[PDB]
Write an enzyme that holds these catalytic residues in place. Sequence first.
Site, mmCIF file in Angstrom:
data_model
loop_
_atom_site.group_PDB
_atom_site.id
_atom_site.type_symbol
_atom_site.label_atom_id
_atom_site.label_comp_id
_atom_site.label_asym_id
_atom_site.label_seq_id
_atom_site.Cartn_x
_atom_site.Cartn_y
_atom_site.Cartn_z
ATOM 1 N N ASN A 187 33.522 45.140 37.865
ATOM 2 C CA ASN A 187 34.685 45.051 38.745
ATOM 3 C C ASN A 187 34.383 44.650 40.195
ATOM 4 O O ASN A 187 35.245 44.778 41.071
ATOM 5 C CB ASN A 187 35.426 46.385 38.727
ATOM 6 C CG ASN A 187 35.701 46.870 37.322
ATOM 7 O OD1 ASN A 187 36.252 46.140 36.504
ATOM 8 N ND2 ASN A 187 35.312 48.107 37.031
ATOM 9 N N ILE A 206 36.230 43.712 45.403
ATOM 10 C CA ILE A 206 36.563 44.714 44.403
ATOM 11 C C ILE A 206 37.862 44.472 43.656
ATOM 12 O O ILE A 206 38.911 44.250 44.256
ATOM 13 C CB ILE A 206 36.641 46.102 45.046
ATOM 14 C CG1 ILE A 206 35.393 46.327 45.907
ATOM 15 C CG2 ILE A 206 36.791 47.171 43.963
ATOM 16 C CD1 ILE A 206 35.534 47.425 46.953
ATOM 17 N N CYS A 207 37.785 44.524 42.336
ATOM 18 C CA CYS A 207 38.962 44.336 41.521
ATOM 19 C C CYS A 207 39.611 45.696 41.311
ATOM 20 O O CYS A 207 39.283 46.417 40.372
ATOM 21 C CB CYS A 207 38.584 43.711 40.181
ATOM 22 S SG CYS A 207 40.008 43.454 39.093
ATOM 23 N N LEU A 208 40.509 46.057 42.224
ATOM 24 C CA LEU A 208 41.226 47.334 42.169
ATOM 25 C C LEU A 208 42.690 47.000 42.418
ATOM 26 O O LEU A 208 43.032 46.442 43.459
ATOM 27 C CB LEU A 208 40.737 48.285 43.265
ATOM 28 C CG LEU A 208 40.521 49.770 42.942
ATOM 29 C CD1 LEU A 208 40.462 50.533 44.254
ATOM 30 C CD2 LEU A 208 41.617 50.330 42.056
ATOM 31 N N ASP A 213 40.263 44.442 32.786
ATOM 32 C CA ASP A 213 40.282 43.601 33.973
ATOM 33 C C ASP A 213 40.436 42.142 33.554
ATOM 34 O O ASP A 213 39.573 41.580 32.885
ATOM 35 C CB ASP A 213 38.998 43.811 34.779
ATOM 36 C CG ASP A 213 38.909 42.898 35.986
ATOM 37 O OD1 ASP A 213 39.964 42.377 36.417
ATOM 38 O OD2 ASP A 213 37.786 42.710 36.507
#
Lengths: 192, 151
Positions: B78, B85-87, B118
Site C-alpha cells: 500500500n 500511501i494508499c489510504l 487495493d
Amino acid sequence: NVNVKKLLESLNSKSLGDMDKDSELAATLQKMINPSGGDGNASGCALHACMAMLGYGVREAPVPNEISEYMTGFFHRHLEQIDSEGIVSHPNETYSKFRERIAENILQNTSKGSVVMISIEQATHWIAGFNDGEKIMFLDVQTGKGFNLYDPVEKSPDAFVDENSSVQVIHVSDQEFDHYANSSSWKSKRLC
Amino acid sequence: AGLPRRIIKETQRLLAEPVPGIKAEPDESNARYFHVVIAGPQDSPFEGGTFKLELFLPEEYPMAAPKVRFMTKIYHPNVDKLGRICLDILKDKWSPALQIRTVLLSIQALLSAPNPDDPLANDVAEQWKTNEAQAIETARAWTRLYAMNNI
C-alpha cells in the site's frame, strides 16, 4: 430491539451521582453504537448518541471510512458554531466545575427531551449533551465515558482543566436530525 | 477564523501525547510540516524499524485533507516508490469531521496488516499476494536497510 426509554428506567432506578450516571449510560450505548471502541469517528458517535436520545433508535455509528458519507455535510452546515470560541475554561477550574458551567449554558438554551452536539476544541473531538428537564447528561459513546475533554482515561471530577480549553455547544435543528434519519447513510447502519 | 484551536490542539497532542508507537517533531522552518516517526509493529515484517513520515497541513485543513507520505523506503503493498500511501481517508474519503490521529492510526494498522483490497495494481502488491513468503523476507530486509540506523 433496543428502547432508550427503558434503559433510562434501569439507570434511574439506581441512586447514582450525576457524573457516575452519564458514564454508565454512555458505557451502555458505547457497546452498541461503537462496538470496537476505536477512535476517529467521534463525530458520528455523538450524532448517533443524539439520535438515540431523540427516539430515532440505536444504530452503529459510521466507522472512519464512512464518516464522509454524511458528516462532511453536517460539519459544513454548522461551521459557524464550530469555528467559535464557545465556553472557555477558567484558570484553576476543575473538571466538575467546568462541566457544571457548561451544563448551565445548555439548560439556559434548550428544553427537556432536547439534545445537542458538543464539539471539544472546535471539532478535535465530539460528545453529545442531553437535557432531561433538570440536569444534562454528557455522553461520549465512542469510548463509553461521560463528560471529558478527549481524555485517554476518564479523569477525576477534581482534576484541573488545562488552561483555556474550549468547548462549543452545537445547536442542531430537528430539520438536520430528520434529514439524517432519511439519508441512506443512516439506513445502512446496523440497528442496535 | 479557521478553527485555530483545533490546529493548536491536534498539533499539541501529536507533539506531547501521541499514539503509542508514534512520535513527532515540528519543522523548524515551516510550522505546517511535521517530522513523524512510526515504529515497525512487533510481529510484523517491519518490526525493529523506525519509519520517517512527512505530515503536511494544507492551508484549508481540515476542509482539505492532511498530506502524509513515507520518507523512508518500505516494501509494502500500500505504499509506492515515492512513499505515497494508499489510504482511502487520505483521499476521497477524507472529511473535516475526521482527525489527524485517525490517519496515523490507520497507517500504523496498515503496517501490521497490509490491505489486500487495493485497486492500485503494483509489482510489490502482486508479490505479497502471489509470493507472500518471499515478500515478507524482502520486507524484513528493507527494514534492516532503510528503517534502521536511519535516525
